[PDB]
């Protein structure tokens, strides 16, 4: 029974998805997030080996001691909703707010964060899960540990090698082949969103707002950024999906060398 086992606190966020609250598991005072997903706005459903949101299937698949992805601790069904209990880092800030407050990130910091996001996304893909909504709003920073956590699997799918013709993630992080053709492959679309994310980190906002910008093929740098970083970004944002790097090629890029440890990142940049 949900209401007996968690003490509900303040609302943390709400939107199309539903509403998420701060909570504490009464058992051991563990910080949690309590996410209410209305059944009306659930598009994709799966089956665990009952009928659940696809979000729950994907979360169960990536669930692990690895801290780069949010851990689903439990879930409950109600008449008109599902309630998802997620681990909550404390103290925490999302990457959207962090970038808004701090502006364009130093490259050392962006390298550490981007590397951690890569490792998180590789974890998802290794577990058979395509996220489909990689963005700064869907990344939490454990401020004490300097560890990033990928959240919000509400637009995800099972990973496959064929074309996707559906998409409900964030349009400004979506690739030109989706904008033009309503078609994309999972990995190359993911790399496109990672390009957008990296630009966002080093310039302080995303490069494109409009469809014509997304398909136009020009990346203008509004901030002073190293040539090596520009090169990686522009590779991730190649118009042709087959011109984009693999995850291996990203992590082997010269800009990606000599990453800080999470603990070093916290000490130098967060504490």
């Amino acid at each position: 029974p949900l209401e007996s086992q968690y003490q509900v606190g303040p609302l943390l966020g709400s939107g199309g998805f539903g509403s998420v609250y701060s909570g504490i598991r009464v058992s051991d005072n563990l910080p949690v997030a309590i996410k209410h997903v209305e059944k009306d706005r659930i598009s994709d459903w799966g089956e665990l080996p009952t009928r659940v949101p696809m979000e729950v299937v994907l979360l169960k698949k990536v669930s692990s001691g690895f801290s780069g992805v949010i851990r689903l601790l439990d879930w409950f069904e109600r008449p008109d909703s599902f309630v998802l209990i997620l681990e909550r880092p404390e103290p925490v800030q999302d990457l959207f707010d962090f970038i808004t407050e701090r502006g364009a990130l130093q490259e050392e910091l962006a390298r550490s964060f981007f590397w951690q996001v890569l490792e998180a996304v590789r974890h998802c893909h290794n577990c058979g899960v395509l996220h489909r909504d990689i963005k700064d709003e869907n990344i939490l920073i454990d401020l004490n540990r300097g560890e990033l956590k990928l959240i919000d699997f509400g637009s995800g799918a099972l990973l496959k090698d064929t074309v996707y013709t559906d998409f409900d993630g964030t349009r400004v992080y979506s690739p030109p082949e989706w904008i033009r053709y309503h078609r994309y492959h999972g990995r190359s679309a993911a790399v496109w969103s990672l390009g957008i994310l990296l630009y966002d980190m080093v310039c302080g906002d995303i490069p494109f707002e409009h469809d014509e910008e997304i398909i136009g093929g020009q990346v203008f740098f509004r901030q002073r950024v190293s040539s090596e970083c520009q090169h990686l970004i522009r590779w991730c944002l190649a118009l042709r999906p087959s011109d984009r790097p693999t995850f291996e090629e990203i992590q082997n890029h010269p800009w990606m060398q000599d990453v800080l440890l999470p603990q070093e990142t916290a000490e130098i940049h967060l504490h």
């Binding site: 959207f96 970038i99 808004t100 909504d133 919000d152 409900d168 993630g169 964030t170 906002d205």
Partner: peptide
Amino acid sequence: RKRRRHPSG
């Protein structure tokens, strides 16, 4: 220049 969130969908 205005930075904003972009809801999914």
